[PDB]
Design an enzyme around this catalytic site. Structure first.
Site, PDB file in Angstrom:
ATOM      1  CG  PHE C  84     -11.148   0.487  -1.393  1.00 23.71           C
ATOM      2  CD1 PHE C  84     -10.769   1.875  -2.116  1.00 23.71           C
ATOM      3  CD2 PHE C  84     -12.047   0.590  -0.263  1.00 23.71           C
ATOM      4  CE1 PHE C  84     -11.144   2.884  -1.258  1.00 23.71           C
ATOM      5  CE2 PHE C  84     -12.402   1.607   0.401  1.00 23.71           C
ATOM      6  CZ  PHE C  84     -11.799   2.843  -0.083  1.00 23.71           C
ATOM      7  CG  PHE C  86      -4.455   3.040  -3.067  1.00 24.05           C
ATOM      8  CD1 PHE C  86      -4.721   3.546  -4.433  1.00 24.05           C
ATOM      9  CD2 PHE C  86      -3.692   2.006  -3.419  1.00 24.05           C
ATOM     10  CE1 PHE C  86      -4.062   3.326  -5.496  1.00 24.05           C
ATOM     11  CE2 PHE C  86      -3.118   1.529  -4.332  1.00 24.05           C
ATOM     12  CZ  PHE C  86      -3.297   2.186  -5.552  1.00 24.05           C
TER      13      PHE C  86
HETATM   14 CU1  CUA Z   1      -3.344  -1.916  -0.252  1.00 23.24          CU
HETATM   15 CU2  CUA Z   1      -1.073  -2.070  -0.298  1.00 23.24          CU
END
Ligand code: CUA
Ligand code: HAS
Ligand code: HEM
Ligand code: OLC
Ligand code: OLC
Ligand code: OLC
Ligand code: OLC
Ligand code: OLC
Ligand code: OLC
Ligand code: OLC
Ligand code: OLC
Ligand code: OLC
Ligand code: OLC
Ligand code: OLC
Ligand code: OLC
Ligand code: OLC
Ligand code: PER
Ligand code: CU
Lengths: 31, 554, 166
Positions: C84, C86
């Protein structure tokens, strides 16, 4: 015989083979 | 100019070339910064002081990819693969259409450029949903690419007119290349045209809520493989039909040249699952089939390697060179139109070697989405294709403009092409090597300076490359502008014949040439191959669509 | 002379082309070999397995990362991974060495990569789709997951961890 064209394709073959077999070794090492 | 009145196609060719080289210049400004980044050196503060509209590494990387790999390459392909067949036939392209293709490209460019420059489409040159760019990026880009549909019509018209005047003659070589090339492009282009019309356009306009990312990627890569052959083939047409003359020899086989091009028409499109080896929901048997057909598309460049090497060896022998290396030293190393494509061909050896690795299914898991990939493609497009176009400045420009190249401009062209070449070679080493170390591509890695300690050594090559190529680019800009803005004009230069090679004497296999000239047939084969390669998968995807919402993460 | 050179060039070219053909076919055979071995587990399942990215963090097997590792066989575990913006969940992903691990990865937002450093696991993660890949870790220790598909401005720092227990 086209000796110089044969040298070129030789360099090309060796390069293809070093790349391919190299990565093929890496693949199995990470397998 | 009375030259432009007789050959208005020189002026429209010039406009495509100049626009293309302006895109190459601007997209290439980000290149040195990206190379320093892959060397773990962060020079983005500087870049942003200079170009304050650049908000991120990623916005610069979107501009670099679109401008260099999409815009410049397309413009060059439209210049070369319309103008050269027109000169070989000595016939005028339909000028209304020629101009319309230019204005479509220019307008599409300007329209996509606005959101790009405003940070409204930092989605990179692959624009993968659900990352969601501004509707003008997708519209500008759609209209930019559709410009090429007009080019295809231009050349098919040339060819048909010529064939009507000359029934039962085989297609002349340069024309035969350009015809199969533009027909290949038509089939190739339909993936992206479909992705755009069915999904991207209605989505970015707000007409549909989401886009299925797997179907969008599948339709993208239908086009995104052959687009690479679309970049490459205009450089090949020069390398086969012009370079042998510039080297001081002759093309050694017309039928072998046609055969390579015919293999590209059949094999360039049905292979795109080799960009999707790491994708879910595509069956592995289909991946293997595309892998096998990808290894086949390697054959025409493997063939090209020998046809072209033998032509160069031939020229070196004509010029007095003997032995097994004497033919190399005898070649015209003082002429940038000769040197640039030859150096690009030398880098294409390790370039093509990487591509054959990438094509190999399971081997792709070692390198996919790592720095290896940019390592490979900078050898192919940013080196071979780009250097071949740079070397064209030295015969094509004078031919289009009557502007002479001085001795001093010739020498500066040599320096540019050498540094560009060596810079690409040095950066290829650092990226191939960093990729084998798991460094990802598309990454502002200088912003995580401790994430990649094992890569310290290839990183020094990337920094060195970034500096070498900065210097090459600056010299290029200075050079291009010096010949462009130059004082003198000698109209005799605009009226001299293009330096087309002769073909060596000996037969020449007419049965084979005639079979290859069955262009309607070969075209239907290429089309059937695409139905066979893509049909089953796309019927399954389209019957199980799962559109998902869009995101803006920049 | 030109006749001679031409004949000789085409003769040797036919030879090179046969050779180059042979080499490509050997690669094909060497690839077919990989496909028959346990190393081919990293190839994604070809199977469409549709999910809803807007509810994947609220219901179903990705909604509770501490329960994401599930024994599915005597020597097999299935791991439900979310990539996802990050990061990855669970973090860390914990698995026993020498077991077969079926990773089922999906995304609630944009495409991410899932590249397990030191292994051939290297798979694209598409919102609305589950990527299924298999791998058996032979060595215990910590392996880094790197996101290798540009997913926005947090991309360069998007990492996760697999811990393989002795
Ligand atoms: Cu997640 Cu690049
Ligand atoms: C113009 C640009 C391009 C060329 C050409 C090109 C060719 C190939 N590539 Fe590629 N590529 C792939 C496979 C291949 C294969 C099989 C070939 C082949 O067509 C190569 C055949 C060429 C050769 C076998 C070399 C022949 C040698 C010659 C012709 C030189 C001879 C020398 C002479 C004559 C000089 C002698 C003279 C003297 C003086 C000595 C794959 C997968 O299978 C991927 C996906 C990887 C991944 O994981 O994402 C990939 C990714 C890319 C990307 C990344 C796309 C992205 O952004 O995700 C781009 C831009 C690209 C460009 C280019 N690529 N490639
Ligand atoms: C001054 C020369 C240039 C240098 C130093 C250079 C450097 C870079 C580097 C280091 C990358 C990898 C960046 C990343 O993965 O984050 C990159 C990406 C790229 N380069 Fe270049 N570049 C140059 C010229 C070219 C040109 C001439 C081409 C095409 C004709 C080109 C096409 C591309 C594209 C297609 C990508 C990938 C964009 C993406 O992944 O979205 N480059 N380049
Ligand atoms: C011009 C650009 C040039 C780019 C250079 C890249 C050259 C060759 C690739 C060869 C692959 C290298 C792999 C070596 C590693 C190896 O041999 O692998 C066994 C080891 O156990 C693994 O972990
Ligand atoms: C240049 C081409 C630009 C493409 C734009 C419009 C073309 C026609 C689009 C028609 C839009 C229909 C949208 C639709 O039917 O949406 C379905 C809805 O998602 C289910 O409930
Ligand atoms: C022809 C020029 C513009 C087409 C205009 C398209 C305008 C669509 C605006 C919709 C939009 O921006 O939706 C978010
Ligand atoms: C032109 C050539 C066309 C025909 C070429 C060969 C395709 C044949 C079989 C593919 C078998 C692939 C099976 C791979 C499944 C791997 C797996 O089990 O994944 C875990
Ligand atoms: C990290 C790697 C970076 C290094 C990159 C280098 C790769 C090969 C370099 C140049 C090839 C040139 C081969 C042929 C050059 C010939 C010039 C020549 O023979 O000159 C003759 C003389 O000028 C009478 O004309
Ligand atoms: C130890 C290695 C050091 C790392 C390399 C540093 C990079 C570039 C040096 C500049 C190279 C410039 C080469 C120019 C060659 C040239 O212009 O050659 C014309 C020639 O006569 C035939 O075409
Ligand atoms: C082609 C032209 C020559 C290119 C690069 C010079 C080689 C540079 C390699 C030196 C490594 C420097 C470095 O970063 O050192 C490694 C690490 O720091 C150890 O602690
Ligand atoms: C006459 C022109 C030729 C001169 C060209 C030299 C040729 C090749 C060698 C070195 C250049 C290296 C440039 C790299 C610059 C700094 C490297 C760096 O960033 O160092 C990191 C270190 O490994 C950890 O801290
Ligand atoms: C045109 C070709 C240009 C070739 C340029 C080579 C770059 C300079 C290398 C010398 C080393 C200077 C490095 C000194 C400081 C490095 C550092 O501190 O980082
Ligand atoms: C005028 C060009 C537009 C022609 C429309 C299709 C023509 C075509 O498809 O080309 C196959 C070739 O003509 C086989 O005779
Ligand atoms: C790499 C080997 C590629 C070249 C393979 C050379 C094959 C030999 C050949 O074709 O030689 C025929 C010629 O007539 C001899 O007398
Ligand atoms: C003369 C005709 C003879 C031509 C034979 C070509 C030999 C090449 C490959 C064989 C493949 C070996 C397959 C075994 C792979 C096992 C492996 O790589 O272990 C991990
Ligand atoms: C041009 C020059 C080319 C030079 C190429 C260098 C290739 C290097 C490495 C590939 C090897 C990959 C081997 C995988 C083992 C790594 C590993 O085991 O790491 C993590 C694990 O967590 C432990 O617990
Ligand atoms: O793209 O190869
Ligand atoms: Cu491709």
């Amino acid at each position: 015989k086209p000796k110089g064209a044969l040298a070129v394709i030789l360099v090309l073959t060796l390069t293809i083979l070093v790349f391919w077999l190299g990565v093929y070794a890496v693949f199995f090492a990470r397998g | 100019s009375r030259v432009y009145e007789a050959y208005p196609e020189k002026k429209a060719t010039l406009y495509f070339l100049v626009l293309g080289f302006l895109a190459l210049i601007v997209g290439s400004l980000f290149g040195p910064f990206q190379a320093l980044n892959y060397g773990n050196v962060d020079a983005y503060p500087l870049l942003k002081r200079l170009l304050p509209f650049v908000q991120s590494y990623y916005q610069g990387l979107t501009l670099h990819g679109v401008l260099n790999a999409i815009v410049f390459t397309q413009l060059f392909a439209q210049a070369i693969m319309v103008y050269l067949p027109a000169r070989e036939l000595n016939m005028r392209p339909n000028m209304g259409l020629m101009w319309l293709s230019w204005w479509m490209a220019f307008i599409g460019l300007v329209v996509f450029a606005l959101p790009l420059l405003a940070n409204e489409a930092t989605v990179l040159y692959t624009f993968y949903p659900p990352l969601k760019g501004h509707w003008a990026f997708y519209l500008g880009a759609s209209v930019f690419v559709l410009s090429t549909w007009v080019s295809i019509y231009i050349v098919l018209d040339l060819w048909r007119r010529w064939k009507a005047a000359n029934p039962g003659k085989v297609t002349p070589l340069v024309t035969y290349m350009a015809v199969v090339f533009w027909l290949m492009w038509f089939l190739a282009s339909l993936g992206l045209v479909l992705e755009a019309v069915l999904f991207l356009l209605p989505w970015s306009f707000g007409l549909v809520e989401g886009v299925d990312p797997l179907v969008a990627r599948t339709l993208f890569w239908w086009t995104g493989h052959p687009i690479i052959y679309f970049w490459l083939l205009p450089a090949y047409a020069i390398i086969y039909t012009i370079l042998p003359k510039q080297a001081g020899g002759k093309l050694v086989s017309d039928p072998m040249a046609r055969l390579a091009f015919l293999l590209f028409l059949l094999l360039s499109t049905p292979v795109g699952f080799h960009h999707q080896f790491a994708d879910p929901g595509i069956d592995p048997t289909w991946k293997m089939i595309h892998s096998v057909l990808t290894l086949f598309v390697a054959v025409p460049s493997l063939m090209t390697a020998f046809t072209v090497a033998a032509s160069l060896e031939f020229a070196g022998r004509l010029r007095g060179g003997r032995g097994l290396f004497g033919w190399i030293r005898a070649l015209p190393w003082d002429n940038p139109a000769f040197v640039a494509p030859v150096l690009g061909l030398l880098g294409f050896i390790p370039g093509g070697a990487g591509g054959i690795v990438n094509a190999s299914f399971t081997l792709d898991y070692v390198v996919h989405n790592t720095a290896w990939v940019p390592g490979h493609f900078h050898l192919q497009v940013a080196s071979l294709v780009t250097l071949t176009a740079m070397g064209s400045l030295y015969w094509l420009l004078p031919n289009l403009t009557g502007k002479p190249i001085s001795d001093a401009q010739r020498r500066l062209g040599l320096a540019v092409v050498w540094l560009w070449f060596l810079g690409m070679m040095i950066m290829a080493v650092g990226l191939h090597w960093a990729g084998l170390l798991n460094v990802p591509r598309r990454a502002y890695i200088a912003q995580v300076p401790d994430a990649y300690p094992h890569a310290a050594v290839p990183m020094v090559f990337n920094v060195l490359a970034g500096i070498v190529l900065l210097v090459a680019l600056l010299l290029f800009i200075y050079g291009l502008f010096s010949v462009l803005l130059s004082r003198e004009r000698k109209p005799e230069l605009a009226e001299a014949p293009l330096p087309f090679a002769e073909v060596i004497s000996g037969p020449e296999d007419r049965r084979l040439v005639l079979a290859m000239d069955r262009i309607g047939f070969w075209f239907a084969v290429a089309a059937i191959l695409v139905v066979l390669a893509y049909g089953p998968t796309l019927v399954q995807l389209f019957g199980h669509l799962n559109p998902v919402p869009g995101w803006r993460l920049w | 002379d030109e006749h001679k050179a031409h004949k000789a060039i085409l003769a040797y070219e036919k030879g090179w082309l046969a050779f180059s053909l042979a080499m490509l076919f050997v690669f094909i055979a060497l690839i077919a070999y990989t496909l028959a071995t346990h190393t081919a587990g990293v190839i994604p399942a070809g199977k469409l397995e549709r999910v809803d990215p807007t509810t994947v963090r609220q219901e179903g097997p990705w909604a509770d990362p501490a329960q994401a590792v599930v024994q599915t066989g005597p020597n097999q575990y299935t791991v439900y991974v979310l990539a996802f913006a990050f990061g990855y969940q669970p973090n860390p992903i914990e698995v026993p060495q020498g077991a077969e691990i079926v990773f089922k990865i999906t995304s609630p937002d944009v495409i991410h990569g899932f590249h397990v450093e030191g292994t051939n696991i290297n798979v694209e993660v598409l919102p609305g789709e589950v990527s299924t890949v298999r791998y058996t870790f032979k060595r215990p220790g910590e392996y880094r997951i790197i996101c290798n598909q540009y997913c926005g401005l947090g991309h360069q720092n998007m990492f996760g961890t697999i811990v393989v227990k002795e």
